Design a protein around this ligand. Structure first.
Ligand SMILES: *[C@@H]1O[C@H](CO)[C@@H](O)[C@H](O)[C@H]1NC(C)=O
Ligand SMILES: *[C@@H]1O[C@H](CO)[C@@H](O)[C@H](O)[C@H]1NC(C)=O
Ligand SMILES: *[C@@H]1O[C@H](CO)[C@@H](O)[C@H](O)[C@H]1NC(C)=O
Ligand SMILES: *[C@@H]1O[C@H](CO)[C@@H](O)[C@H](O)[C@H]1NC(C)=O
Ligand SMILES: *[C@@H]1O[C@H](CO)[C@@H](O)[C@H](O)[C@H]1NC(C)=O
Ligand SMILES: [Zn+2]
Ligand SMILES: [Zn+2]
Ligand SMILES: [Zn+2]
Ligand SMILES: [Zn+2]
Length: 639
């Protein structure tokens, strides 16, 4: 407890460039021989320095090598600071280190091999840094190690075998790195392991089948790796697993039946894999919370017992080959927040019991075979924000009560057999951002009441039996629509309202395949945000407003084909930089062809076809690799 230690900690105060909280200030005022009473510094019963605890003190600077002088040092804490530079190789001399820390900093360089000399090191904490280079095999000498937490770094190469000798390991975290190489079966040797996080790396090879050895394991995460192979049987050995996360891997073979024993499992993420086989039983005895087995090749019905674990909050079985019906048993699990049974081959009606879910937030069951009606009980899902039911065999009238869900935000009912007219009660949902009713048998004209929902960003009403005209006040209520507008493939008549000009910020506009008659309003010169415009398959007539496309510029695709468009081709098409595909086939265009469409680099597809054009056909540009069918037939063209 003499001079050299004080010299060492004073040497440590130096190098620490900036100290905004004034922590080391306290080490100056007190005194020299009173260092044991300094902020953070605590000594033993003999006066020697054993602990340096400076956490969240916002210290910046570099870690000083003089900390190799403090021989009696057992714990070095620097949690959540700004210590840049690297780790000193002399820090292996400390032989009294018990637990060494340096979490949440800016420590670059690679981890020194000299850390293998810390014979008393029980806890090594180096995560959330810039630590590069390979994992040092010398770390396999620290035979007292329990917690090895070096995740969230830039560490590379493969896992040294030595790490599997450290038999006292309970926590192990190598996640969030650039580690490669397989996961050796030698993990079976850390029998005292309790936490294994390997997720977010570049691990390959077969899956470590001897993971069934460590029966104290409670956390197992290996998400986002190229780990292939089958999940082991007798998985029901480890009756202490609570989190099991192997998603986004190349896992094959079925979900082991022995997983029925694991009674402590709460989290199972086996998604984005090639897993096969039917789904087992036993899930009714597990008290889980998140079951995510989507994006797999799972066959067979959805197991009834899965409906007994009334604390299940997330159920995700989508993108599978799952048959069967969504039984009414779903009425039991009332803690359920998000359900994705989409992209499957489920049959049967929607059960009324679904009105018992209460706190349900996301309801996704599209791309299946759900027949029947939408129950009125689904007005009880007040917390619901997302509803998807497209690509199904759902039919009949939309229940009135289901417009009493103020909180609902997104609705996709497209591609079904809903008949009848569009209810004005759709106004009751003044909080929709997405509305797709496309692909149906919706008849009658468009309700103007829909001017209520001013928060829309995607309005898809295409492919229907929609007659009448487009209400101007409805188009006008959508001022700041951000994305998509599709009225195409209907029986809409009349003219294109001037209120379409108020629709700025909108990217895709499609009014094709209708009975529109009037010429193209100049009103819509305001929408520069438009990427794709489609007014094809209509009875439109007139000249093409140069002045309306002069201020469109951001057009990616323009389809004005099969119309009664007369006039010349606007020169404004040359100033169109982002132009890619232009279609003006089947018109009464009597122009001479602009020389500006020639020298267009971004341009690629150009359809003129059945017109009445004259003059010399251009050369340089997209006329080099042009087809003759695109020109045939313009009556007369020299070139
Ligand atoms: C396994 O964990 C239990 C409970 O924490 C503990 O009593 C036991 O020591 C551990 N077994 C081994 C081999 O480490
Ligand atoms: C383990 O699961 C629980 C929820 O079941 C969760 O709070 C926790 O983050 C998970 N642990 C990890 C990060 O593996
Ligand atoms: C079942 O799991 C939930 C969440 O982990 C918890 O609230 C509940 O207490 C658990 N039941 C048991 C057996 O402790
Ligand atoms: C608009 O909706 C129709 C409905 O059939 C669809 O087929 C079409 O591709 C959509 N338009 C565009 C270009 O996004
Ligand atoms: C433009 O739309 C018309 C009529 O709807 C269609 O026949 C044609 O394929 C479309 N043009 C192109 C090539 O996008
Ligand atoms: Zn993690
Ligand atoms: Zn994960
Ligand atoms: Zn989906
Ligand atoms: Zn004019």
């Amino acid at each position: 407890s003499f001079e050299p230690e004080i010299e060492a900690l004073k040497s440590f105060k130096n190098g620490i460039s900036n100290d905004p909280l004034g922590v080391l200030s306290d080490w100056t005022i007190i005194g020299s021989l009173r260092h044991c009473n300094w902020t953070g510094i605590t000594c033993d019963s003999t006066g020697h320095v054993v602990s340096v605890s400076l956490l969240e003190k916002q210290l910046e600077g570099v870690l000083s090598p003089a900390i190799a002088n403090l021989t009696y040092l057992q714990v070095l804490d620097l949690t959540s600071n700004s210590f840049t530079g690297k780790i000193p190789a002399e820090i292996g001399k400390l032989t009294e280190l018990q637990s060494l820390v340096l979490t949440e900093n800016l420590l670059e360089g690679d981890i020194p091999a000299e850390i293998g000399n810390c014979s008393s090191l029980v806890q090594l904490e180096l995560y959330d840094n810039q630590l590069t280079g390979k994992i040092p095999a010398e770390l396999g000498n620290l035979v007292q190690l329990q917690a090895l937490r070096i995740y969230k770094n830039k560490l590379t190469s493969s896992i040294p075998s030595s790490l599997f000798r450290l038999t006292q390991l309970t926590h192990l975290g190598l996640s969030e790195n650039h580690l490669v190489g397989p996961i050796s079966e030698e993990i079976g040797f850390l029998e005292s392991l309790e936490v294994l996080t390997l997720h977010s790396n570049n691990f390959t090879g077969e899956f470590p089948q001897s993971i069934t050895n460590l029966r104290n394991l409670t956390v197992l995460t290996v998400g986002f790796n190229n780990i292939s192979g089958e999940l082991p049987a007798d998985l029901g050995l480890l009756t202490n697993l609570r989190n099991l996360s192997a998603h986004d891997n190349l896992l094959t073979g079925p979900i082991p039946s022995s997983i029925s024993n694991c009674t402590g499992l709460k989290l199972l993420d086996l998604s984005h894999n090639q897993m096969t086989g039917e789904i087992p039983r036993g899930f009714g005895r597990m008290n889980l919370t998140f079951i995510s087995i989507g994006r797999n090749h799972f066959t067979g019905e959805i197991p009834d017992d899965i409906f007994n674990c009334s604390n299940l909050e997330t159920l995700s079985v989508a993108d599978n080959n799952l048959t069967g019906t969504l039984k009414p048993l779903i009425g039991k699990l009332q803690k359920l927040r998000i359900l994705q049974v989409s992209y499957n081959s489920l049959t049967g009606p929607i059960p009324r019991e679904i009105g018992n879910l209460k706190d349900l937030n996301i309801l996704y069951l599209h791309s299946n075979g759900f027949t029947g009606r939408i129950p009125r009980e689904m007005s009880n899902l007040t917390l619901l924000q997302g509803l998807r039911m497209y690509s199904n065999d759902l039919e009949g009238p939309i229940p009135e009560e289901m417009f009493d869900m103020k909180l609902l935000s997104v609705l996709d009912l497209s591609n079904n057999k809903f008949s009848g007219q569009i209810p004005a009660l759709f106004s009751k949902l003044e909080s929709l951002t997405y509305l797709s009713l496309q692909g149906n048998k919706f008849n009658g004209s468009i309700p103007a009441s829909l001017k209520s929902l001013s928060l829309l960003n995607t309005f898809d009403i295409s492919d229907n039996l929609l007659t009448g005209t487009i209400p101007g006040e409805l188009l006008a209520s959508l001022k700041n629509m951000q994305l998509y507008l599709n009225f195409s493939n209907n029986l809409l008549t009349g003219t294109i309202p001037k209120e379409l000009g108020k629709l700025e910020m909108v990217q895709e506009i499609d009014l094709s395949n209708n009975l529109f008659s009037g010429s193209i309003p100049r009103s819509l010169q305001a929408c520069k945000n438009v990427f794709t415009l489609d007014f094809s398959q209509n009875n439109l007539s007139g000249h093409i407003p140069d002045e309306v496309f002069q201020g469109m510029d951001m057009i990616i695709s323009l389809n004005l084909s099969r119309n009664s468009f007369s006039g010349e081709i606007p020169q404004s098409f040359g100033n169109m930089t982002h132009l890619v595909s232009l279609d003006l086939s089947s018109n009464n265009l009597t122009g001479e062809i602009p020389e500006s469409l020639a020298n267009l680099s971004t341009l690629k597809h150009l359809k003129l076809a059945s017109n009445n054009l004259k003059g010399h056909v251009p050369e340089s540009g997209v006329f080099k690799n042009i087809n003759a069918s695109d020109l045939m037939g313009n009556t007369d063209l020299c070139g």
